[PDB]
Amino acid sequence: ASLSLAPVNIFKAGADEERAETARLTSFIGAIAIGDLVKSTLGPKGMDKILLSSGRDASLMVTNDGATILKNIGVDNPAAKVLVDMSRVQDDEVGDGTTSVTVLAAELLREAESLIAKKIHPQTIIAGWREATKAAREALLSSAVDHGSDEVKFRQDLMNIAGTTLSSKLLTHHKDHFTKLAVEAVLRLKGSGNLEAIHIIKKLGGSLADSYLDEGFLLDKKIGVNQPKRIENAKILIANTGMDTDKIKIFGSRVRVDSTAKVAEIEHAEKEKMKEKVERILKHGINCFINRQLIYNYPEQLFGAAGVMAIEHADFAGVERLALVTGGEIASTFDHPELVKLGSCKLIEEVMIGEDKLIHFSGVALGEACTIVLRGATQQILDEAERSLHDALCVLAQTVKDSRTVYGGGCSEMLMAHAVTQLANRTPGKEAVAMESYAKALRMLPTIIADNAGYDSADLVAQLRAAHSEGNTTAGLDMREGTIGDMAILGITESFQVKRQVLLSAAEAAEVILRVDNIIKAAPR
Template identity: 50%
Template sequence: MYKYNNIPIFLKDVKKIVELVKSTLGPKGMDKILLSKNGNFQVTNDGATILKNALFDSLALNIIRDVCNVQDEEIGDGTTSVCCLIGELISEAERLRSIQIHPQLIIKGFRIATKKTLNIIESKSFDYSNDPLRFCLEILNVVRTTLNSKIISPFREHFSRIVVKAVLKLKGSTNINFIKIIKKCGGSLKDSFIEDGYILEKKNGISQPKKIENARILIANTSMDTDKIKIYGAQIRVKTISRLAEIEVAEQKKIFDKCKKIISHKINVFINRQLIYNRHERFFMEHGILTIEQADFEGVERLALATGAEIVSTFDIPSKIKLGKCKIVEEILVGEEPMTRFSGCSNGDMCTIILRGANFQILDEAERSLHDALCVLGQVIRDPRLVWGGGNIEAHIARELENFSKKIPGKTALAIESFSKSIQGIPRIVSKNAGLDSIDLINKIKNAQEEGQEKACLDLNKGDIGKADELGLIESSKLKAQLVISAAEAAEMIIRIDHQFSEKTPEN
């Protein structure tokens, strides 16, 4: 048995979710505290993080959360904008339904408007990839624009250069897994820095060499702790202590045979995910091999990717073992903690970003901010088309869609006009969050663009309009296109719903 609820309840949930998130949009947006049941908390203004952790029993939340996750995975940024645009589209659709316009006509108008919007974005985009110097300057502006609304915005110049340097070190690759971020409490955000090479958060073994050149690295996940007798988990009964000693000697011999097999691969660096006991560590040291024990899984996986190694657990067949290579392995100090740096890795020039901050909440949010900037810049390297930011492209879209709707006959024109109002809702929310007169500013931008000032945009610091090129406000064209596509598809899915059914529990 099933029962159904009227759809207005569903739409109220959508509005409630959007209201929760939209106050975080823009450079002047507010932050949210996410409090867990066990008392832990995090401070963030990232839309995807807020929705992912929100305890709100609603199908609307699941729909919007999935869309924001897709935006986060595809582009890395714009999750809050997607959520706000969905809310604007649903509000406009509800208004159209109140004047007896059928949902199918609304969907048809939104589809036409979406296609037209993508054409406008493409026509207004520009590409400086043929001019390397200009392109480097513009991608620096892209990162600055992305970081404008993040917790690290007061130091965006410092972090922008870190992000650009990190991505350029990938030499054309867009795999940001080659960039590791280490968080260490202490100092302030401006003390963060970038280090060449991959840094593993583990120190070398006791009395190990501090530096190895032309390293041949074996990465393993194998047991090296036979001080405790483990024979397949079995219990062994012995009558004399001498018999127990014989078993221990046999176990030790087995492990030393394993050590000899490891040495036979002519390596000079051995990294193990599990313990390496002191006796075996000393054995490796006597043969000039640097050892690192209990390396974390994620760190080992990335190190294997960087050095070209494969993680192994047995050493019987040398032909099936792939060693990693790098130019230098050395121990360094990060703050006051010793770590190991791998420079000149065989699979590209990796780097590590070390974040410093007053507490773990700031460091976690800074990491999310840097991740967004790295993802956006990776997309720009892949697709170098850019558009002017600060509400410029939204104003162009809204103005051209309004003119386009006048050429469309019938009620579909009203849906296209509503779509244009929804698009300009994004700069309206941004300016409202800054405490400014949003309607006045948006009208000023549209009037300036009609008078030929193509680069007119919001200047939130002055509370007026400015020029996007002078303010350095540039965004990825693909980010804007994906934002519109995701929001339009989610809105269409919600508009199509006319009843919400739920299973009715049978009576006893």
């Protein structure tokens, strides 16, 4: 019998269970719904969604990123939750491929329900999918090409990858300028992988083409009242000291005297201690002083008397970025000036961006930290531009870490599907049908890409399949007019890591979802 379909009920109120066919139906419906929702935002001609929050703040978000779409949706289907978590993990691992992996998983599960309706055990489907995944991964690895040795070829590959990443997003209007910006920003990292070193500042107003990458660095902090607003050949001292009513860390200490004169003497002693600390700081021979914490009025006045710029309340990210861009060392003690490296930059001045004033660093020494100013007409435009630029920077950093690249436009999917089919028509059993379904989903991915553009998807996919079977391993979708072209010539390139991660994550999620034959829900809280 069954737990729910028994004369005696074994559950508390509000708790139920779903057996084989019902659980499979619910999981498949959830997965197909998620895939259909996230798709149509895929490829160069994909559109954007509107995420209208129902909360008190009622945040409005217009986005093309699949991960952001799947994060901010009320999901009750557990399989849909699995797909959403897959997309989030994919976004964490690499910047792109969230929509691709979600759609691939949905198509795999659709083929799975078709095979189940064809009376095939799910374990056979899992085995066939494992074999197909192995074959496709081997083919993709064999198809990868590396250009890390050649500087100019690697730079061209970086530009092509940035263009391919930005083609789908809203930045495709100024793709060339934005790709130049992103490539320069990533190359300024000098091999480091911390994207936190690249700061994206969003300023309302101005055209989207007005966005630019600053040659130096921009800080959104303020300067003391009586301090210079412009210094040349600045020597920077980045600090993390208190400088705010600095108390002795002996928390059990107190002032216990018998006269107010002694209290005044102790207060003057405290002021003298602060003055001595400021003098020790000044002994380094500095022009600008940046402290992570706040700076109270007395040290600010002392700095102003010496004509030293004093930027206060620059957070951990701020001081880290300043250290990266200027080469200075973040300090907290000033008893050994000779052991502390001072940052240096050609010019510090206050610039006027929009209706706000920012501190500009020009001619920085190291420059291993970028500030990107984004200008737009709406807040939603700025947010979407920031997300797209983040995706491009993530993919570029991944390409820098691993220079292996594969061709986009469906070419990689077509070759993996061809390898899967070649494996499928070589072995007997229903595993052949499972692998055929795997290849069918892999081919359905560029089919959806072509659907999004309104082209004749069936004819284009048939031509691509014929070309890949013949031996043309670089044929793909030429999205400019709706034909098949050479992605090597057309410069449509993707990171090998992104495609491998998409394939493996989609296969993993499809396998784990297909293994479920019973969904048991506890009583909701």
